Design an enzyme around this catalytic site. Structure first.
Site, PDB file in Angstrom:
ATOM      1  N   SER A 230       0.736  -1.202  -0.031  1.00  0.00           N
ATOM      2  CA  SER A 230       0.031  -0.016   0.140  1.00  0.00           C
ATOM      3  C   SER A 230       0.720   1.356  -0.046  1.00  0.00           C
ATOM      4  O   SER A 230       0.036   2.263  -0.018  1.00  0.00           O
ATOM      5  CB  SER A 230      -0.906  -0.002   1.394  1.00  0.00           C
ATOM      6  OG  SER A 230      -1.807  -1.213   1.052  1.00  0.00           O
TER       7      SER A 230
ATOM      8  N   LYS B 268       0.052   3.303  -2.944  1.00  0.00           N
ATOM      9  CA  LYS B 268      -1.302   4.212  -3.117  1.00  0.00           C
ATOM     10  C   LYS B 268      -0.560   5.701  -3.017  1.00  0.00           C
ATOM     11  O   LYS B 268      -1.527   6.636  -3.470  1.00  0.00           O
ATOM     12  CB  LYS B 268      -2.282   4.126  -1.807  1.00  0.00           C
ATOM     13  CG  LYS B 268      -2.599   2.699  -1.911  1.00  0.00           C
ATOM     14  CD  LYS B 268      -3.591   2.507  -0.490  1.00  0.00           C
ATOM     15  CE  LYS B 268      -4.435   1.195  -0.695  1.00  0.00           C
ATOM     16  NZ  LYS B 268      -3.679  -0.171  -0.602  1.00  0.00           N
TER      17      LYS B 268
ATOM     18  N   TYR C 258     -10.938   1.923   4.667  1.00  0.00           N
ATOM     19  CA  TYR C 258      -9.585   1.711   3.939  1.00  0.00           C
ATOM     20  C   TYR C 258      -9.861   0.675   2.858  1.00  0.00           C
ATOM     21  O   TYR C 258     -10.324  -0.408   3.132  1.00  0.00           O
ATOM     22  CB  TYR C 258      -8.573   1.435   4.829  1.00  0.00           C
ATOM     23  CG  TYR C 258      -7.138   1.276   4.290  1.00  0.00           C
ATOM     24  CD1 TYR C 258      -6.902   2.376   3.555  1.00  0.00           C
ATOM     25  CD2 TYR C 258      -6.476   0.080   4.475  1.00  0.00           C
ATOM     26  CE1 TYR C 258      -5.242   1.996   3.067  1.00  0.00           C
ATOM     27  CE2 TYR C 258      -5.329  -0.154   3.874  1.00  0.00           C
ATOM     28  CZ  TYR C 258      -4.679   1.060   3.271  1.00  0.00           C
ATOM     29  OH  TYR C 258      -3.136   0.798   2.738  1.00  0.00           O
TER      30      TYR C 258
ATOM     31  N   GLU D  38      -1.047  10.111   4.462  1.00  0.00           N
ATOM     32  CA  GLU D  38      -1.914  10.253   5.833  1.00  0.00           C
ATOM     33  C   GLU D  38      -0.903  11.113   6.643  1.00  0.00           C
ATOM     34  O   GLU D  38       0.262  10.874   6.949  1.00  0.00           O
ATOM     35  CB  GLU D  38      -1.978   9.027   6.394  1.00  0.00           C
ATOM     36  CG  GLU D  38      -3.149   8.145   5.657  1.00  0.00           C
ATOM     37  CD  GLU D  38      -3.243   6.833   5.741  1.00  0.00           C
ATOM     38  OE1 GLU D  38      -2.963   6.395   7.159  1.00  0.00           O
ATOM     39  OE2 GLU D  38      -3.769   5.955   5.171  1.00  0.00           O
TER      40      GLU D  38
ATOM     41  N   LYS E 172       2.916   6.464   5.155  1.00  0.00           N
ATOM     42  CA  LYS E 172       2.189   5.641   4.877  1.00  0.00           C
ATOM     43  C   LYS E 172       3.131   4.060   5.026  1.00  0.00           C
ATOM     44  O   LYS E 172       3.993   3.995   4.931  1.00  0.00           O
ATOM     45  CB  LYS E 172       1.846   5.569   3.257  1.00  0.00           C
ATOM     46  CG  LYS E 172       1.080   4.802   2.501  1.00  0.00           C
ATOM     47  CD  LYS E 172      -0.365   4.971   2.987  1.00  0.00           C
ATOM     48  CE  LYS E 172      -1.203   3.941   2.737  1.00  0.00           C
ATOM     49  NZ  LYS E 172      -1.289   2.685   3.770  1.00  0.00           N
TER      50      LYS E 172
ATOM     51  N   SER F 241       2.226  -3.418   3.031  1.00  0.00           N
ATOM     52  CA  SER F 241       2.395  -4.822   3.265  1.00  0.00           C
ATOM     53  C   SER F 241       1.966  -5.665   2.088  1.00  0.00           C
ATOM     54  O   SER F 241       1.057  -5.191   1.226  1.00  0.00           O
ATOM     55  CB  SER F 241       1.588  -5.388   4.754  1.00  0.00           C
ATOM     56  OG  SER F 241       2.120  -4.404   5.796  1.00  0.00           O
TER      57      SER F 241
END
Ligand SMILES: [Zn+2]
Ligand SMILES: [Zn+2]
Ligand SMILES: [Zn+2]
Ligand SMILES: [Zn+2]
Ligand SMILES: [Zn+2]
Ligand SMILES: [Zn+2]
Ligand SMILES: [Zn+2]
Ligand SMILES: [Zn+2]
Ligand SMILES: [Zn+2]
Ligand SMILES: [Zn+2]
Length: 347
Positions: free
Chosen positions: A59, A62, A145, A264, A300, A303
């Protein structure tokens, strides 16, 4: 390296406790990159990890997908308040006539799940899945999420630019960011640099629909630190710079975490408790209501089966850290180590 003892002190315990085969760590401070490499990329070859080793970052992808979306906005191909069906004729006549691109990007469309159902394993089944999907929450009200959510955002951003997603990333966006060894599809010449992931049974493993967009990046600590530099010092291209800046804006908060495009964020200095809570199972796995948005730290986690990645940085202080491992070891351990190292760098 005068930073080696500090980094080693926080990283070596992780390696031992979680039997991590290899980890590439990169730190930025004072405009300078520092690389600290541990263990092996491949237990069969015994090849040492370096800052050129490719890891699956899951991720963390992202953040890169978010940057492509922002780039499409900067280029005028789309806007975040566009309805999603504007960029996908196949969504016309569904609830995606009433959900925005920004809502997809920020997991707030209304309860799209973490993963596609296992059965959704083709283009045709994927389109059917979205067209039958029943909202759980009103658009904008809850963060859940979601790979289907941001995956669709990235897919439609690519469509708005009239090119395939993998091509846009590998030929335009990533080289534009100074990331020339960052791939959705690892090419033949790069395969020898590609780590294996290690499952809990120590089986070597490597990485579904919208995988490229949601979680499919392979990259090195050197390339990811270059992306951190781009997020602090900037890039040469004006359009990319504006795109990067769009990914820093806060859209809404959940506790002390502020959700933007990919990244984030948190007020910095950030307590370990606040950083753990925003990266907690509750925030990752459950629906949480959106609240008004908030020096700033951006982060961020990512995994995959056999891999565990984390990136965090603080533009106001010119510091950042990348930690890429071929064990999927617990997120709280990643957060605690990064927090401790960054605090030492911040002084
Ligand atoms: Zn040491
Ligand atoms: Zn150094
Ligand atoms: Zn072999
Ligand atoms: Zn498509
Ligand atoms: Zn290149
Ligand atoms: Zn590179
Ligand atoms: Zn693919
Ligand atoms: Zn910024
Ligand atoms: Zn928004
Ligand atoms: Zn702190």
């Amino acid at each position: 390296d005068p930073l080696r003892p500090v980094v080693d002190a926080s990283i070596q315990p992780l390696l031992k406790e979680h039997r991590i085969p290899g980890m590439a760590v990169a730190v930025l401070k004072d405009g300078k990159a520092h690389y600290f490499n541990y263990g092996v990329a491949n237990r069969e070859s015994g090849a040492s990890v370096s800052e050129q080793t490719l890891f699956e970052i899951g991720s963390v992808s992202k953040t890169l997908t978010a940057t492509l979306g922002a780039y499409a906005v900067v280029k005028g191909a789309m806007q975040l308040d566009d309805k999603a069906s504007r960029h996908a004729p196949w969504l016309k006549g569904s609830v995606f006539d009433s959900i925005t691109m920004g809502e997809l990007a920020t997991y707030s469309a209304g309860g799209l799940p973490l993963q596609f159902p296992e059965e959704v394993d083709s283009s045709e089944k994927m389109r059917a899945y979205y067209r039958q999907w029943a909202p759980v929450y009103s658009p904008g009200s809850h963060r859940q999420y979601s790979n289907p959510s941001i995956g669709l955002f990235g897919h439609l951003a690519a469509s708005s630019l009239k090119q395939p997603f993998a091509q846009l990333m590998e030929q335009t966006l990533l080289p534009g960011l100074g990331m020339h060894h960052t791939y959705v599809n690892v090419p033949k010449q790069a395969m020898a640099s590609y780590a294996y992931g290690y499952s809990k049974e120590d089986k070597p493993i490597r990485v579904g629909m919208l995988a490229d967009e949601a979680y499919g990046i392979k990259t090195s600590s050197a390339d990811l630190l270059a992306f951190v530099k781009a997020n602090i010092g900037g890039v040469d291209d004006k359009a990319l710079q504006q795109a990067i800046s769009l990914t820093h804006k806060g859209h809404y908060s959940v506790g002390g975490m502020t959700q933007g495009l990919g990244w984030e964020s948190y007020a910095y200095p950030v307590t370990e408790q606040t950083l753990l809570a925003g990266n907690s199972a509750k925030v990752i796995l459950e629906a949480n209501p959106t609240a008004a948005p908030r020096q700033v730290l951006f982060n961020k986690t990512g995994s995959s089966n056999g891999f565990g990645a984390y990136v965090a940085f603080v533009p106001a202080r010119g510091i950042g850290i990348v930690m890429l491992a071929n064990r999927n070891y617990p997120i709280p351990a990643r957060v605690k180590a990064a927090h401790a190292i960054l605090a030492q760098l911040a002084g």
